[PDB]
Amino acid sequence: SGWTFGAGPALQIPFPMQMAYRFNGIGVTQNVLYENQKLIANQFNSAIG
């Protein structure tokens, strides 16, 4: 759900779109995430590992 589960009813939303939301919230455009999605995913997986 993202952040809506803590401010009211839960709303379903794809996780890449939630990541685009969180990237646009800090000033970075959503295109860098919508284009380089595989790189961000691999970096996140490597960090989690």
Partner: peptide, 19 residues
């Protein structure tokens, strides 16, 4: 490079007014 994108049409506020 965008995954999950679908084909559609967008509107232009200049083409119908110019034509």
């Amino acid at each position: 490079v965008v995954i999950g994108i679908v084909n559609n049409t967008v509107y232009d506020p200049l083409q119908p007014e110019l034509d």
